[PDB]
Amino acid sequence: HWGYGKHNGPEHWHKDFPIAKGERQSPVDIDTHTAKYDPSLKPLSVSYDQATSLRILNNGHAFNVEFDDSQDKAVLKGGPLDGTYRLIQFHFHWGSLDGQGSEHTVDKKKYAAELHLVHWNTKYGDFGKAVQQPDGLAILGIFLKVGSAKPGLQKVVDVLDSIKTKGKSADFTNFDPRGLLPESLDYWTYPGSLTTPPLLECVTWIVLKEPISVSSEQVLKFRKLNFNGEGEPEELMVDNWRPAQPLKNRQIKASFK
Template sequence: MLQDPLVWGYGRNNGPDSWHKLFPIANGRRQSPIDIKLWSAKFDSSLKPLNFNYDSSTAQGIVNKGYSFNVEFDDSSDKSVLSGGPLTERYRLAHFSFHWGCRDDQGSEHSIDDLKYAAELHLVHWNTKYKTFCDALHHSDGLAIVGVFLTIGNSEPELQEVIDALDAIKQRNMHAVFTDFNPACLLPDNLDFWTYSGSLTIPPLLECVVWIVLREPINITKEQLSKFRSLYSTTKGEYPQRHMVENWRPCQPLQGRQVRRFLK
């Protein structure tokens, strides 16, 4: 499973530049995120439209992980699955999380021709040909993560439902019930995408991810983004208290990988 954030983080002494000391794979050949270069992304006619088949009844809870927060889903059945695109199997939705920064123009993990966005949503799915999420982590096609950029703009009522739940999980390890939510409402209208083979962007940085990065961003307001930054990476009673203000990993070398694109 994913590693304890007490061991790593985003600070000066335990941030992404130091992760290779504990996780040598950080210097691997298919690390994420990457900077997507528009001129070199290859159109691939074999790619299919994405099919998001989500069921709001699978939403279970929201938890402060110390490095971000997760909205978690019941993945014991195929009620909420992703298929299509570059995928040849069905992938079950496990959770989604966000990455953001201390600046409104520098919070996403992926970038497009060196352009970053205010934040980035990751919808994390695992391949149903494997027995469990943990099993899938050890295979090159184990996970499919959909990345959605967020840009400063008008209020998104659907996102506000998530924002409103954050007051219940201010500190690390705090958990609250969060049900009856269909994350398809967080997707943009246009589902054109780029795809490439990559890794988790947090330790243990395993190279098990088929990345699908959507071209069209969704909106987040400055006020909503400030609620992300108001979360703590520390537990209740821990001193000093530290806010989650910058939880993104810098772009990694492409290492000869091909980025493919799907356009309707």
């Protein structure tokens, strides 16, 4: 019964998921004055030419755009990573107001939203195996600010009416996730966790330096989604973000000078 409400939000998750107070929790604040350039980091390689989106699902916590992950169709490699990571889904976290919504922060700045492209390490065979490994997942995080529209987001926005409530899904084929990337692939990286229960410490985080812009109308449509199921009292799906967690015995590395 975890969520982001008045009585089940992030500050409560530790009771059912005690690693919520663990050593490698996410998100974190990225202090640009202490993250150090690491010349041993490599560019990242984002290979989404062959990506097969399938479906979009309102899971009661966000919406997931799901991919074929039964071959090396959409992969993330390079950067800080060893080996190959398959795209399984992407989703967002966003606010009720434009001054909040991101999970990671940059010098304490909150963005309006944050996109997570979730990938699993093919050495482990399936996502469920991967999440049990410290190097099982690679999550590419991209900040959203409100300004111009993002054309590549509009087909996501326009399907949201069909998945308003928890448990609804819709066919969502032929979506190109390249349309959600910023110009630059400069990034910060650190070891952390899933930001939702079960909060497993299985993630190499790769957070892009450059935000994307979305319009105020696009974010407004995110904010019309519902946490609740059909026929239940309406609870707008807003503020579905976990706040920054203690960095502890970690360093954030920068790919850029």
